[PDB]
Structure formats: structure tokens, C-alpha cells
């Protein structure tokens, strides 16, 4: 393609609101444009990268017999009522009415739709297993869209769904997908790690998330150096082995603590280490108010609380709800309320806690005497340095972007939506399901996060929108224009060449080229009359003069040796 | 792919409601499944056909420098307010609210979105022309979804938009698109004709529709045998040259006409030919009621009326609106109402018309004496046999499916949405726009309409979901299964082979194969031990025995000679 005919609105200045490097670079390089919060257009270069990603995805899906389909975005509410998700979900599910008042969801994911396709069609065990996938734009009215394509409201997902006669068959396809996902991410230029993910509040099914390792990552991976242990910090269990720090029991005492809000401020005020303070938070669990206690150097993990209580309906009590129930909160109160404490609170006595009265705290508070703990448990995040759940060694942290997930779904949808098959013994059984997804537009951004420098994007060979950037320094000069025209015709059969044929200053062409980030650059300039050009590598910045008779061999060898 | 792993829910019986052959066959062959009215899932084989169509589309777009992008479905109402389409359109535009009460349209087409992309980015004449396109699902809440993929509510469109400094540049790209569209349709196996289309009520810009010639087609193409004249029957002008059939003027007379509703019933009742009766219809044009007169053998053309009056707000008066104004209607009434008559009414005198009184009609009604005609004009459809507007010869009719359109849009959106560029002389000018579209999912159905027989689909080589159907008659037999396994491995590198490896009766495999419609079939049966198979052509039904040492050459030669 001649660059004069390709829309590439490169920017001089990136706005302050853009925080993530991938977001900043996709804007600056003229690859995406925001329509509104969380909603983007993919401009020509991004679209080519998306096409390269989806071609790799299609190869890897076909390799494991995952068969492509395309399902609708517009989905009748009645389908979502069958599963119960219509009623279970709130504003994140986008909803609308047609001209006859009939209600619809815009698909955030397709468990019901795909179940509706296969039910009473996958009728026998002889037809199983079956795996279907699509590459299709999903809709989620995210509370906080952010970081460009990393969290949109309209976004591209590759979602797959598999159907099975038994658990062993599901296990096989889950492994196939796991392996296919590893291949997909490596091929597109992402360094990713599969990590054990949380199975949800109620379920205990096997699930792994694929995490693109990057500093912008909002997930923390807990990993071992001694074993293959890798878990989301939300899931990673903390094993408690007693190590008491108890002193002589003292009488309870309310103390004045003016302008003291936080646990660390209280620690500083009393001249004590923060770990000896116990923090108290009020949660609302299935309508009932509870208290959760953790030490001052720890933080409450809501995902563990949800899994512990076995419900997703857990949230912090609001300002008004706290006042109606009881400044800094504490466990000593004359009221029927269940108090839960993290296991590591047992290492202390003479607790420092809130007084349920602004400007005050309690010291020398003791369990049994002053208040009772109903149950102890693992209600916190692991810290870096602590011993892992498998006993292999010490916990280390790495930050990650969730680029995909694999999930053993089971019979949830097939039971609720009556999707059955006749087994070996002729009896009706619900289809056993797996579901799997890659965030395609998120993955595009993750590629940029891991493949860029201070001057722009550095696209991997596998996904670069064009292979070669052919640039004329001054096309007013006949020798330069004509040589570049000839080289375009020569190289645009074997390679995809972006030919910067524009009547633009050399400096802007090179700045644009740095942003755009194609792996190899052929510069036609002052030595065109001699049949000499310059070849420049985007990754290293290495430049060399090359004569046109050698150029095909030099470019091909350089291209083949790219990662 | 092994057919045991591909979801293909072939049907024994097609429901009565499915009318169009393409709709019936896409259902019967297991290629689509309805989710609800006008909303479909594309099953594995249809998805492969769609991928083949879009690959051809992409090649032909790149050939004319039409550059791929991907724009969002979710579009803020504020954008649609800029153009005025938010207010101009009614229930066909699907609308919704997000969680903050902000209003959105689901894109039925993307003129505003694309204008928002390029405005203040295509800043100079030096950047023009620019052509962008996407392949993306559109949403239209159609009043009457029908014929499967021919009229959906969620459907795939390839929409392109071009931007220009002057009218000559627009003319060039319009011609490029016209030519590209001709190529696309021929390549995918559609016999199509470009025809002059109506430019709308207000505008007079150049537009052509591409019509897939087929009997299910709801459009009628008027064409010449002597010239290149081709027009939609909505547009095709009728030139009136007087041929009076006048008799001696008679006195007006009201006559009893019991149980006479229609013009032909009245003709039969009075013993007169139907052409001597004048029909009267009441229309509402920009709030004002009018009368339109046409002869009994003619019909009113609303598209001509809209173009004549220069407004889209024309509709028939309702039952209640007719009563408030005045059985069979007629022009003789004591009221201030404008009466328009088709030109061919002038060939008659002593008109037979309604009496504005149930059970009665008027005879011997004459213009000037009994009523006045305000204006005469071309308000009807041309009939087959009549002389064409260009004077080349006689009108012939062919039925067609509108598979695409090309349109010289001009500055409508660039004016309303302030999308300007600096011209040669440094002054701001609105971007001159073209817009173009192909219905991709409609085109898939049109391919089936033109490429099928009584036993199933007959896919063209260019778009067939697989190239070869490899079928084992009885895979319990080791020689058959093993030979078929070997041939699959041999042929699935050069070709895409669907291998019917299923443990199913031969009869169902062949019935499924006929429906599925791949061009060549390799049958492994009783002579597998001898290294002999049967090759069968789907189009002709010709079968021949072939030895496996000759099979690659025989298949390749047959495949190369397919249309
Ligand atoms: N709002 C979004 N924008 C872009 N990509 C997304 C978004 N939500 C999910 N994805 C991607 O789609 C994949 C599958 O969806 P899903 O498993 O439902 O995500 P999720 O659990 O909601 N992730 P998150 O919201 O980031 O915690 C994810 O692994 C992401 O890569
Ligand atoms: N409801 C639909 N279902 C499937 N395809 C459609 C639909 N509407 C339009 N298309 C296709 O998209 C192309 C461009 O859209 P457009 O020019 O807006 O169609 P249109 O004038 O509304 N046609 P029609 O509604 O059939 O009279 C058409 O030429 C069709 O091939
Ligand atoms: O979407 C999932 C589970 C899996 N679905 C198939 C693709 C891969 C993915 O991990 C989790 N999820 C995430 N977000 C959601 C948001 C809404 Br709104 C709804 Cl209704 C449902 C969901 C929802 O089910
Ligand atoms: O969509 C068009 C004009 C052209 N747009 C770009 C692709 C090719 C197509 O011919 C005509 N059209 C047809 N149907 C529509 C339905 C609705 Br609802 C709206 Cl808002 C707008 C429209 C509308 O503009
Ligand atoms: Mg989410
Ligand atoms: Mg329409």
C-alpha cells in the first residue's frame, strides 16, 4: 500500500488522561480513535494487526478441532431468563427493546446462545465431543472503562464452547485449549503465564487465566521458584502455622486518638508497630451484617470471603448502614453480630482496635473476655516472602494482564436450558460444557505493552501490519521517486510493503515510521542514482547501506532472523 | 476437518414458513439457525463460506486502495443528532441507554461514525482522496424480516466511504467501486447487473444498485435489448406521447354498483375494458391531503411521487383520515383538494370513477366540467412492452435481489458535522463523500439462490466451505477406513477436505453430502482393497471409478476445470 492512500492520523501530543503506554502509543501512532468512553474505532494499521492475530487464532483453533461459528449480538431476554442471568446481572448487561416492546440483551458472552444452538441437535453420545468458537464483538457496560483497549465497553473476544459426554472428554479439550492458548500468545509476541484462577463463590471447577506479564497489569501472580505453582493473588491460600507474640493480659482501656484515621497513623500515634493493630471492616453477606478482623499490615481479600461464605452477594456496608448498626470501627459492641477474624490475629493478644466512637480507640482488648470470634480463617492476601500453600517455597509477585481464561463449566446451562443427549446406556444426560476465551482487542494492547520503546511500537514479525517500510526522502527528485517506485513493485509481491510515497519532510516520515513500528525500513535517498539504499532495523536501530542488487537477499535474511 | 467434529445439523423436514429456496436450503443443510425473527447464527459451514466471501472482498478492496477499518456498533445519540438522523428516523433505528442514562444507537450504517473519524484529520487537499471500508454487523429493526438472510435485523454489511477534494475525484472512486463490485459478485458466483437507482426524494446524485438476477427478487429491473439502459422499475421514466381515445361528451351519471370493490370488478360490471376506469387514491404529502388519478390497468408509483413533490413524507391516508376528508373514492367532491393525474389519463374522456359513496360509482365524468386536474405527470410504473425513456426500444422486466449499492453522497454529512479540508487556494471546503455497500449475508443467500438444485446447494469453487467431500461407506471395514484415512492425509494439504468419517449409514452420508454441496466427492467403498474409489461431481452428478495412483491428477484436473 502507498502510505498517501492509508489513513494514519499520527499525533504530535498525547493527552494527559491516557495512562497506559499501549493506549498512549495506539493513539499517537494513529491506530485507534475513541468514539466515546470505552468505545473505539480500529484504524487501518490496527485492523491489519487484528487480521494477523485472528489468522493465528484460526490456525490454532483448527489444529485442536475447535470449529468456527458466528453468533448474534442481539439476544432475546427470554433466553437469558432460562439461565437466570437476566435477573442475576445488573447494569453491566446492556439491554434494549425492539419496536414491538420485546426485550433483548447485547451479548457480553454467549453461554445461552450457544446452548440454544446445540440443544436437541447434539442428541447422542456418538456426536460428542463438539467444540465451537467465534471471534465477535461483546458488549459490557463496564463501571470504569480504562486503559484504551484493555477495558472497553465494546470489545473483540474469541469465545469457545465445548460439549462432552463425560468429565474425561472435558478434561481432554480443556488441555487442548490450554495448550492452544499458550501457542497463540507466544506466536503473537506475548510473554504469558497460565495461572490458577478463582472458580467463583459457589463452584469449585478447574480454571486457569492466561496472564500477559507486564507492569501495567492489574492482576498479581503469586509464583514459586521451586515448583510450577502459579496462582492469582485472589486465590493464593495462606497456610497459618502458629507463632504467638503474646504478652501479659492487661485491662481494656479507651484512649483519645485525635486526627487518627488509618491503622498506620494509629501505630505511629501509640508508638507500636502496625502489625499489632487489628483493623475492623463491616460487610453485608446475603443481607446479614458481619465483622471481619485483620492485622494492620494485612488487607482483606473479598474473593476469599465470597468463596468462604459461598455467595457472590458480599459488599462493604455503606456510611448510612454503618451508623444505623453502630469513626474507626471495632469488635467490642453490645449487639448480635458475627465476628470473623483472619488466622494471623491469633498470634496477638491485647489488641488495638476502634472504639466505635470518633476520636477514640481501644487498647488491651482480648478475645474471650472483651469479645468473641465466631470463626477464624484465611481472609487476606498473601504477602511477598511468605511460604506457599504447596510447601515448595517463598511467594514472589509478578504483575499481569488477563488476556484469556479456560473454564470447566459443567452442566449449569444444560440443566437450566434442558440440553440433553442420550448416553451409552440410552438415558438422557445434560451436556457437559467447557468455555474458553481470549480478549482479542485486549491482546492487541498487551502486544504493544510488551513490544515498544520510547520512539514507538516495535511490532513482532507475526503481527506487524506491514513487513517493510519503504521511504523516499525527497520524491521531488526523479531518481529517488523512480527507484522507490521500482523497489515497491519488486518487494510488494513477497512482502507487504508500506511505501511512504508522501510529499512530506524526511523528519516527519521517520518520526511516523518510528511510531508505526514495522520491523525493517528501506530508505531511498541521496545515493539512489548509485543504486544504493539504507536498511534500518526498528528493534536495534542498526543501519547499513545496501546496493539494490543485494537488497532482496539482505532483507529476506534479516526478515527470516527476526524473532 | 473430520465431519464427526463439525456441527452440521441437517434436517429431514423444512418448516412451511420458509419460502425462499436459499432460506429453505440453508436451514435444511445445517448452515444457519434462527435465534429469533431476523436474527441468525452462522453455523460452521456458513462461517467458512462467509470467510471465503470476505477474503475475495478484501482482495478487491485492496486493488482499488479501499483501506479496511473497523468501527463500533454502539454509537452515541449526540453523533446522530449532529446529522439530524436521530430525529429523522423512527423505530427501524435501534436505540438504547447505558447505565448513566446516556442514549445510543446501534449502527444501521456508519456515515456519522466515519465522518467523526476523518474530521480534522483529513485536513488538507494533499491528503485526498481517501477510501475506508469495514465488514461489520449492522442493526435495523426491519418492519418485516423475511426470507432468512435476505432481510435480517442483525446482518453483515461491507460498507465503504470515500473522501474527496472535488467532484472529478469522487467520480473516479465511484467508477473504481462500481468495477470492484462487478468483480466481487462475478467471483463469488453471482450473476448481477448494475442498474440506475432512485437518488431519493430531495437529491439528484448518481447511484447504481447491483441486482442479483433471481426469481425470488423483490426488485424489478427494466432493461433494453438495443442499448445499455438498465433501471429499477421505481426509477424508470414513462414518456407520454398523446394517443387520444376520446368519444362524444356525455352527461355525468351516478350508477348503482353493488358488491363492486376493485377497478377490474367495475370493468366487468359495466362491460368496459379496465383501462377506461380511472382509480383514485388519497395521499398525505407534508401534512396536506391530495388525490392521485391513474388508469385501471396502471398502478401508482410512490417513489416517483416522492421525487416529484421532493419529500419523503408521503403516505396513503388512513381509513379514519379518508372518512374525515370525504366506498370507492373519486375526484368529484366539493372541497379544496389538489388533484394530480397520471399523463395517460389524458388519452380518455368520459371517465369512470368512484362516487365517494358506498355502493355507487360515477360514469361520463369529464375534466374541466366536473373536476379540475391541478398537474399532470409520470406517477406510475412502466409496463412491459412500452417504449423506454432513452428511445432505444421496448421495456423488458427481470427480477432482482439488491446485493449492493454505490452512491455519490456529496457534502451532506461534512456540512452538518463540520468536516472540512483546506483546498488548493488555502480556503476551507467540506469533504466530498461517496458511500458504497455490499450486503455480505444477503449475498451469501443470493449465491445459494443462483447455485442449487432439488437435492441441495451446489457451491461455486470460489466460496465452497470445503473443496472435496471424502466419504467412507462403511468405516467398520478396515480397508475402507484405512484407505480413507490415508487419502485424507494426502489431499488435506493442497485442498480443504471435509472427511465424512462418521459411523452413519451410506444413505444419510450421501443425502448430507447432496445438501452440503461441495464440488467434488471421493467415495471409498467396496473396492478399497483394490485401491479403487469413485469420484462424483456435484453439479453434473457424473460418477467414475478412479485408482488411487491416478486420483491426485484426476481431482486436480476436475477442480481446475470447475467454473
Ligand atoms: N471490558 C473488556 N475490554 C476488553 N477485553 C475484555 C473485557 N472484558 C473481558 N475482556 C477479555 O475477554 C476475555 C474473556 O472474558 P471474561 O473471562 O468474561 O473476562 P473477565 O473475567 O470479565 N476479565 P476482567 O473484567 O478484566 O477481570 C478476558 O480474559 C479478557 O482478555
Ligand atoms: N435487513 C437486511 N438484511 C440483510 N441485508 C441487508 C439488509 N438491509 C440492507 N442489506 C444489504 O446491505 C446493502 C447496503 O445497505 P442499504 O443500501 O442501506 O440497503 P437498503 O437500501 O435498505 N436495501 P432494502 O432494504 O433491501 O431495500 C444492501 O444492498 C443489501 O445488500
Ligand atoms: O464470560 C465469562 C465466562 C466465559 N465465557 C465465555 C468466554 C470466556 C469467559 O471466561 C465470565 N463473565 C464475565 N463477565 C460477564 C459480564 C456480564 Br454483564 C454477564 Cl451477563 C456475564 C459475564 C460472565 O459470564
Ligand atoms: O445506508 C444507506 C446508504 C449507504 N450507507 C453506507 C453503506 C451503503 C448504503 O447504501 C441507506 N440507508 C438505509 N437504511 C437505513 C436505515 C436506518 Br434505521 C438509518 Cl438511521 C439509515 C439508513 C440508511 O441510510
Ligand atoms: Mg469483567
Ligand atoms: Mg432497507
mmCIF file of C-alpha atoms in Angstrom, chain B residues 172 243 328:
data_model
loop_
_atom_site.group_PDB
_atom_site.id
_atom_site.type_symbol
_atom_site.label_atom_id
_atom_site.label_comp_id
_atom_site.label_asym_id
_atom_site.label_seq_id
_atom_site.Cartn_x
_atom_site.Cartn_y
_atom_site.Cartn_z
ATOM 1 C CA UNK B 172 -13.061 8.210 -10.241
ATOM 2 C CA UNK B 243 -52.862 8.852 -28.282
ATOM 3 C CA UNK B 328 -64.673 3.737 -3.806
#
